Every structure is written in C-alpha cells, then in structure tokens.
Amino acid sequence: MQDAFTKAIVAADLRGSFLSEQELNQLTNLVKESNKRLDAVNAITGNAAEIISDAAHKLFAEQTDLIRPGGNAYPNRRMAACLRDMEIILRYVSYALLAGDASVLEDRCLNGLKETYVALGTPTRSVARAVQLMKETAIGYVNSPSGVTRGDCSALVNEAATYFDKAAASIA
C-alpha cells in the first residue's frame, strides 16, 4: 500500500536517487496541512452513517425503479447489499484523504469493482450516482463541522472529491 510519502520514495528509487529538494518540500507541505487532513478524515468518520443514509434516501428518491420488484435494490437482501456498499466507499474515500494517495482505493476497492457489477446485473450508472451523492454530503461535512478552527480546506475538499470522482468514473 502507498501513501503520499511512499509514492515519492518509489519514484525517487526508480531514479536511483535520494529524494529531490523538490519532492522534500512537497512532503513538508503535506505535514504542514496534516491537522486539517485529520479533521477532514474525522468529518467523514463522524458522520459515516448519515452520509450513507442521506445519499441512499436521495438515490431512491431519484430512481424509484430500484425499489420496485425487478429493481436492483429490492428485496431487503439487495438493499442491504447496496447500503453497505455506500458505506464502504465513503469509508474508503476517507482513508485516501489521510493517506494522501488513491492507491488503497484503486487496488482494494475500485480494483475489480466495475466487473462485478455487470456480471451481477447491478446498474453501474445508479451506483455511480450513489457515489456522487455521498461526495456532496461528505464534503458538506468536511466544510461545516463542530468547533474546528476557521481556515481554508478547499485544497483537501478537492482532493477528497477526486477520490469520489475516481470511484464514480471507474464504476459507471
């Protein structure tokens, strides 16, 4: 598994080199913003259930076919499979936010995720949408939390978004 430092190290090694002063300071900056990062990961963990629930309510509000017989979130067994899914992805996204690298997401989750769904008959476009809704709400929470020091988290909100967007793209 990689994190943002480990990634630097692998690229340096492929040159046969000690880390460039370029790469060093990029990583010094990641340490600089790490308290914000911890709050951002904490924002997701602290609202995981609601993020999944709210995404869910809204997914089925839009796509009332999934909860009809014939639909891929019917009966209870399938809904439970779907609702757990949302939570995993939200949880996976927040690991990446702290690692500062998408690899755990791509390798352990998205890795193989598209394939399954087509074999199963699970509508990937609906799954992509559920991921887009988790993103909206998750970032909502990253941006408006309990008594965190005021500052600018937009860099981290972007990065979190790209993890949500990776997953969506990979699946649709």
């Binding site: 598994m1 911890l38 990961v41 995981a48 949880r91 690991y95 702290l98 755990v104």
Partner: protein, 162 residues
C-alpha cells in the same frame, strides 16, 4: 510499504471501521515526528558522498586483508560495488526517515538479504562495520530527536544483519 499511515489503515480495513480518533493520533504521531525525521534526512542526504567513502574505507581498515589480491576488497569492481551498496543502505535510511517507518528498508533491503549475501559470499560483518562507522560520524551532524531517528534506522539495519 510500512508507515504509521499504512499500518493504521491496514488495521482498519482488516477490521472495517472508519478512521476514528484512536487512529488519528497514531497518525498525529507520525506527522508530529516528521520535522526531526526530515532534518536527519537532509543531513544524511547532503553528506551522503562522504558518509559512503568513510564507511567503505572503514570496512578495509577493519578487515585489512580484504584489500590484498585474490580478495573481495580488491580491484575497481569490488570496491565500486561496495560504495554502491553502502550508498543503497544510506538511501533507504533516508527513505525510511522521510516515510515514517521501516517499510523502505523492509521491502528493498531486509526481504531477501541473507539469501543474497550467502550466495554472493558477502559477510554481514562488513556491512555492520560500515554502519557502525556511519553511526559514529552522524553523532556530530545531528543532535536531539533528528539524531535519535538517524540512530533508530541505522541500528535497525545492524539488527537485520545479526
């Protein structure tokens, strides 16, 4: 690749729970510690050239016979491959410093070490003595928590070789 960050994530994943406050401090430790680590890294990085030549020589001074003909410290190619090898070790030490864990050392030098050294007739004693010397000189390039970090990883290599 073992870092504080990858370790806590691995433990969550295998356990399926959101990164929560118990975990966040683990991570905070790694981030709080980066300054000392990275100071050690910068000092080891710019002194690399001489740290390597110092340790290479010390292998010959401690094992005089190595530099006689028919031996493995003789001729340009042996002495070249030696400098390179110590340089590999210092390189991974800096990586381990920067990464926040032994991962780079575990994955690129420790995994397989003995099998390789045994097939190629390379004695660990040389490498321990290279590292003991590097440890002596790093005593005056650093101090405080950067020195402790440098030491942690140098000693880690010496234990890997014993």
């Amino acid at each position: 690749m073992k870092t504080v960050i990858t370790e806590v994530i691995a433990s969550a994943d295998s356990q399926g729970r959101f990164l929560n406050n118990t975990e966040l401090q683990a991570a905070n430790g790694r981030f709080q510690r980066a300054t000392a680590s990275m100071e050690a890294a910068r000092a080891l990085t710019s002194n690399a050239d001489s740290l390597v030549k110092g340790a290479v020589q010390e292998v010959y001074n401690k094992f005089p016979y190595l530099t006689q003909p028919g031996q493995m410290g003789y001729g340009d190619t042996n002495q070249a491959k030696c400098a390179r090898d110590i340089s590999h070790y210092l390189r991974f030490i800096t990586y381990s410093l920067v990464a926040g864990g032994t991962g780079p050392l575990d994955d690129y030098i420790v995994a397989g070490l003995r099998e390789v050294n045994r097939t190629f007739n390379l004695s660990p004693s040389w490498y321990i003595e290279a590292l003991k010397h590097i440890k002596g000189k790093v005593g005056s390039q650093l101090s405080g928590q950067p020195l402790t970090e440098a030491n942690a990883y140098i000693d880690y290599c010496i234990n890997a070789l014993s």
